[PDB]
Amino acid sequence: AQVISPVNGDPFVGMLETPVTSAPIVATYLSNLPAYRTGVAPVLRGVEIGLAHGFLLAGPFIKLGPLRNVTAEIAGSLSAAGLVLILALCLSIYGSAQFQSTPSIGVKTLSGRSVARDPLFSADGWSEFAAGFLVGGEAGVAWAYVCTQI
Amino acid sequence: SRYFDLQDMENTTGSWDMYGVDEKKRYPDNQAKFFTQATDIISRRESLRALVALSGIAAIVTYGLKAKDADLPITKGPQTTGENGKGGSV
Amino acid sequence: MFLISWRGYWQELIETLVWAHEKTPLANLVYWKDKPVALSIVQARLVGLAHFSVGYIFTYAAFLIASTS
């Protein structure tokens, strides 16, 4: 039996469903992540994504910086709080252009029935994400220097 | 065994949500309430271009203007006597 | 670079990149408003010339001044 097969039956769609892409697992983990969830309101997703990057940006600006050889973690603290606020400009300005009239997603599931469209892509959508990326980011940054410093 | 249907206008081209499972909230009762109320005033998109821009400049203009050797080597300034030029200058 | 290598290479480069993006998960959720395309021929023509001239001028200027000084 072939490990690799056409995309959900269709062999004339630009993709190949490998055991990397489609499998018993991976289809369960990626849905567990904040962004891919369909039924939840647009507030709580942005916080769960936004917070996370506040810790991925936090470690960095401590040990490699100019004041690495000394204010080393105060130095690294608000600099992680920054790429947060710029992303918020990037994501608020990303939103400012795109959405003028109604959403646009692959409406159905793998099962193929017409499920309700997500608020991930809408006028009131990316706003609460852009807010989630801020309140998550700014607060989420503070806890990489209440634990490593204070 | 036919992927060609005008009435089925979405299955045809392959707009299949690959890993978009329609599951319930695994997120907690107490914690989801902590972070709805906390992240609901900053929600609006118009308020971000007013807050993030002007308060972000207020973040640069605070930690930017606050001037000694303690944190950077320029507000430190020149801490030795001037060097001699090429055309006998000061 | 912009003077010697021309469009057909770069566009097909982009052509694979635009597939690459559209079937990358998480990144899937972001899509462009303006379709990404290779710079024109005339664009390539100008952009080469510009880089060439700027480099010319700046290089000499640095040389002229630093040597004479």
Binding site: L89, Q98 | A53, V61, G64, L65 | K33, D34
Partner: peptide, 29 residues
């Protein structure tokens, strides 16, 4: 150190920051 502590980082960031922002919105919309 009074003037150039303010005007350099505003011309360095805050002028291009809102310029790249308000010119982006002029292009796409």
């Amino acid at each position: 150190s009074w003037a150039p502590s303010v005007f350099v980082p505003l011309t360095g960031l805050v002028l291009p920051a809102i310029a790249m922002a308000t010119l982006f919105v002029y292009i796409e919309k």
